[PDB]
């Protein structure tokens, strides 16, 4: 029921679904109920998965890093992240990337990373 890009794109900043059980917008907004409708007027929030991966890697020398979202009481419960593996460590609440400085040369060697590194 949708020709325009608002009716096909999963989000303005991402064409594709980001979970296996996610219904593609093209099939979700199809059928009789979407016939005489403005599609740009429909709610289409930006995909959070694309936005969090623009966040640069917060480098640290310490092995363990605390993350609470940065709002103090306005964030998430404080958790502690281990950066000892040679990879980008990510907060399981807010998705923020963290990496140890010991792994900077190997991470810079990597062809493509999950996070910009800069």
């Amino acid at each position: 029921t949708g020709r325009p890009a608002s009716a096909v794109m999963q989000a303005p900043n991402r064409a594709e679904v980001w979970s296996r059980s996610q219904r593609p917008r093209s099939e979700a907004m199809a059928g009789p109920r979407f016939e005489q409708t403005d599609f740009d007027a429909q709610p289409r929030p930006w995909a959070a998965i694309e936005l969090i991966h623009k966040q640069p890697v917060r480098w640290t020398h310490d092995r363990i890093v605390a993350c609470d979202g940065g709002g103090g009481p306005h964030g998430h419960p404080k958790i502690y992240i281990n950066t000892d593996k040679p990879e980008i460590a990510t907060c399981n609440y807010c998705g923020l990337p963290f990496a140890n400085e010991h792994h900077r040369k190997y991470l810079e060697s990597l062809p493509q990373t999950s996070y910009p590194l800069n």
Binding site: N13, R20, S21, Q22, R23, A28, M29, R33, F34, Q36, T37, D38, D40, A41, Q42, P43, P45, W46, L51
Partner: protein, 134 residues
């Protein structure tokens, strides 16, 4: 309920054209200082010598004025939920590239009305029949 001295004074401060226009939408003779303008073009005013809860008011940009036309942060200000107008509100300055750029009014009774739908895939998948050849 304006009273003579109030209405006569506001008339002098605003002029008869403005007076009659104000009488065409709000039905009162109000005058105050311009606090600011929102994204949709609504103008917001304050006067602390008015009656309680009448010290803040909006002049709507659109003839068919609707209460949902008010920009979010201004909605808090006019409803006395905050005292700092959005013109001085730091939380209005955080850059959110995902934030809606044009104002979002209520879209009911139009063809932009929100249509709900299932956001998930079917729970069960049937076999795709493959007749084996003889």
């Amino acid at each position: 309920m304006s009273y003579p001295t109030r209405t006569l004074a506001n008339l002098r401060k605003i002029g008869l054209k403005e007076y009659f226009r104000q009488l065409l939408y709000i039905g009162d003779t109000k005058y105050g200082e311009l606090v600011g303008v929102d994204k949709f073009g609504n103008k917001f005013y304050e006067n602390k010598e008015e009656l309680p809860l009448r010290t803040r008011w909006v002049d709507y940009a659109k003839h068919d004025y609707d209460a949902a036309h008010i920009e979010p942060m201004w909605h808090a200000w006019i409803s006395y939920q905050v005292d700092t107008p959005p013109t001085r509100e730091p939380l209005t300055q955080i850059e959110r590239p995902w934030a809606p750029k044009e104002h979002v009014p209520n879209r009911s009774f139009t063809r932009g009305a929100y249509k709900p739908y299932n956001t998930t895939q079917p729970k069960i998948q049937s076999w795709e029949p493959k007749a084996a050849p003889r």
